[PDB]
Paper text:
With only very few exceptions, cilia are built by intraflagellar transport (IFT), the bi-directional movement of proteinaceous material sandwiched between the microtubule (MT)-based axoneme and the ciliary membrane. The IFT particle consists of a six subunit IFT-A and a 16 subunit IFT-B complex, with the latter further divided into a 10 subunit IFT-B1 and a 6-subunit IFT-B2 sub-complex. Here, we present the crystal structure of CrIFT80 to show an unusual N-terminal double β-propeller followed by α-solenoid structure. We show that the N-terminal β-propeller tethers IFT80 to the IFT complex via direct binding to the calponin-homology (CH) domain of IFT38 (also known as CLUAP1, FAP22, DYF-3, Qilin or PIFTA1) whereas the C-terminal domain is required for IFT80 dimerization.
When crystals were later obtained for fl IFT80 diffracting to 1.8 Å resolution, this partial model was used in molecular replacement to finalize the IFT80 structure. In the crystal structure, IFT80 adopts the fold of two consecutive seven bladed β-propellers followed by an alpha-solenoid extension of 4 α-helices. These helices organize into two tetratricopeptide (TPR)-like repeats, and are held in position via interactions with an extension of blade 6 of BP2. BP1 adopts the fold of a canonical seven bladed β-propeller where the N-terminal residues contribute the first β-strand to blade 7, effectively closing the β-propeller by a zipper-like mechanism.
Residue numbers in the entry: 1 to 8, 15 to 639
The structure:
């Protein structure tokens, strides 16, 4: 994918509302409205004041919108902070700072407004403009502030440093030196908890919430002047001197675009649906970017989302391409798998059998789709109104799993996982981190919710077999990898120093990054049975280093595709044999499996077969396998 860019003294601030209007604040002392086509529509207001920053009152869903929430706040150079309506009516003007107010953000729950001054103060206000508290007084201008999602913590920069402070508690403000120079912008994703920064050392960087560096860019020619997370948390944008870059959440860049005489891009804002962004530059021009050329593939099928109207389906059964009919509303979310293509527009969900593109099943959407997941039998669609929805591939809603205190706007693909019989959801709260399971038939809770002692980074369900086969992996914040069956549910630790893990597409096998090495478990369940045989069915490629923070993108057939932190996709061969053993054994062909193992004389396959045999209680076979293993010793 890439950023498709369109360009419209200084344009000081930009911000999209949930109605997909872009408001821009310029040094002409005017505020203008723009539409998603990147066209100017109206002068909304004119003020005797210069602008530095703006923020729309945050709305989780325009469907659950009702209230006086159609307002935005603007920071001014005279130190005032003004709340304006969508129509430009001044609701409230606040004398917030001495000298310019240079950054501000509404809390996510809308109960507070945070402002920061060149005077180095960070202040917290009620909407009534009352001073709620002075959070901080730094020794340098606080160029950028953002909230934690719970609104009990604020992240801000001062000098070279990033600071995280609690509003309620005191404890210890976490702080670190982020850049070798002045930090110019920060952002903190509420959905993936990652922090991004850019500054005068001419780099951008990605951090976790604890100050651990996850990515640092090479040198730009000039300071990085803005960074912004897409609401999806899967992408962020970077602005600089006549440049705009689109980055993966891992940090590496999809595209770097040179802009036409914009000066530095000082301000960034994304649309709520993460498909577009806007940037304000020192020149005063407004830049519009659209995320395009999304590529999906599954087996022989390749799908390219050309733009928000146009999709091509490439069916390489004979080097083919089919252009889908142009979409009547903007394409928002697309997913491919299991022989089906799902296209969610702003108002409709299309489900295509990829072999019969001419007859999709289509149903109405009443809210913005925020996630699509697919399994063999059905798929999952998420929005912030009805929440978690499980659909047949003919478009019939099967169930709507829910639980008290579920916050759907915080779920990404790391937090919720689907399979043929089970859904698992990470329920993250100040009180506790627990994994909750639900069945896909009725959406009813399955078993007792599982509590971990540490914060969890991500969870994922295995795909093969039945409910008794269903397993969850858990990676926690210490980078420990756990295995947890849905039904027997007794946890086991599989690895330390785990950066990633992925279930095999078609079998119970598991892959993971373990201290930067590729490790494969041919039979992960063995950990509950026999630690010694578990080790014999676990293979680590000792000499292949995937670097820091590598992410497994696919584990299927006999290959594992691994995305490195630097954006390089590595293809690693795994054993050609264990999937064949799985196939043979589900067909009860124990004779054939023993013959195969006798032919390849591979101790790890003998161990895998022995594990399979013991679980099936094929004792004759297990005996042969153990005999073969003990023989090579
Ligand atoms: O996505 C890819 O294959 C790449 O990195 O070129």
């Amino acid at each position: 994918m890439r950023l498709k860019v369109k360009q419209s003294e200084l344009t000081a601030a930009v911000g999209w509302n949930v109605w997909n209007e872009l408001f821009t604040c310029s040094d002409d002392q005017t505020i203008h409205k723009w539409n998603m086509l990147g066209e100017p529509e109206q002068k909304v207001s004119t003020l005797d004041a210069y602008f530095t920053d703006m923020h729309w009152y945050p709305v989780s869903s325009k469907k659950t919108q009702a209230g006086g929430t159609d307002v935005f706040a603007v920071a001014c150079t005279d130190g005032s902070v003004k709340i304006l309506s969508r129509t430009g009516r001044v609701e409230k003007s606040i004398e917030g700072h001495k000298g310019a107010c240079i950054s501000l953000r509404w809390s996510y729950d809308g109960t507070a407004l945070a402002t920061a001054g060149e005077d180095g103060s960070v202040k917290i206000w009620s909407r009534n403009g009352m001073l709620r508290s002075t959070l901080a007084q730094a020794d340098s201008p606080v160029y950028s502030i953002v909230w934690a999602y719970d609104c009990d913590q604020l992240c801000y920069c001062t000098g070279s440093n990033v600071v995280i402070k609690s509003l309620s508690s005191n404890a210890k403000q976490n702080a670190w030196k982020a850049h070798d120079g002045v930090v110019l912008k920060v952002d903190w994703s509420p959905i993936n908890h990652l922090i991004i920064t850019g500054g005068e050392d001419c780099k951008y960087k990605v951090w976790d919430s604890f100050g651990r560096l996850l990515f640092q860019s090479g040198l730009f020619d000039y300071p990085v002047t803005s960074v912004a997370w897409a609401p999806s948390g899967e992408l962020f944008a970077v602005g600089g001197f006549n440049t705009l870059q689109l980055c993966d959440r891992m940090g590496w860049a999809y595209s770097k675009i040179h802009l036409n005489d914009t000066g530095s891009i000082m301000t960034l804002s994304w649309t709520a649906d993460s498909t577009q962004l806007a940037g304000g530059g020192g020149s005063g021009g407004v830049v519009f970017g659209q995320v395009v050329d999304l590529a999906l593939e599954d087996g022989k099928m390749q799908v390219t989302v050309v733009d928000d109207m146009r999709i091509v389906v490439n069916d390489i059964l004979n080097e083919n391409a089919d252009e889908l009919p142009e979409f009547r509303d903007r394409v928002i979310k697309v997913s491919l798998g299991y022989g089906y293509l799902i296209v969610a527009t702003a108002t409709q969900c299309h489900v295509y059998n990829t072999t019969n593109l001419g007859t999709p099943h289509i149903f109405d959407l009443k809210d913005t789709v925020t996630l699509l997941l697919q399994a063999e039998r059905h798929f999952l669609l998420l929005d912030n109104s009805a929440g978690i929805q499980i659909y047949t591939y003919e478009g019939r809603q099967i169930c709507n799993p829910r639980f008290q205190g579920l916050r759907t706007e915080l779920l990404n693909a790391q937090m919720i996982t689907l399979s043929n019989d089970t859904i698992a959801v990470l329920d993250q709260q100040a009180s506790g981190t627990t994994v909750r399971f639900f069945d896909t038939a009725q959406g009813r809770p399955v078993g007792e919710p599982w509590q971990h002692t540490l914060e969890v980074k991500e969870i994922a369900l295995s795909q093969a077999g039945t409910i008794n086969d269903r397993q969850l992996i858990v990676i926690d914040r210490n980078r420990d990898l756990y295995l947890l069956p849905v039904m027997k549910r007794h946890v086991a630790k599989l690895a330390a120093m785990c950066d990633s893990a992925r279930w095999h597409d078609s079998t119970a096998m598991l892959s993971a990054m373990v201290d930067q090495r590729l490790c494969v478990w041919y039979y992960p369940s063995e950990v509950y049975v026999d630690k010694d045989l578990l080790a014999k069915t676990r293979y680590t490629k000792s000499d292949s280093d995937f670097g820091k923070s590598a992410q497994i993108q696919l584990f299927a057939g006999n290959r594992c595709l691994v995305r490195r932190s630097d954006g390089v996709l590595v293809s690693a061969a795994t054993s050609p044999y264990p999937a064949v053993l799985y196939d043979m054994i589900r067909k009860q062909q124990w004779d054939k499996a023993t013959r195969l193992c006798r032919f390849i004389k591979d101790p790890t396959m003998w161990a895998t077969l022995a594990a399979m045999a013991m679980a099936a209680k094929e004792l004759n076979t297990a005996e042969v396998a153990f005999a073969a293993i003990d023989e090579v010793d």
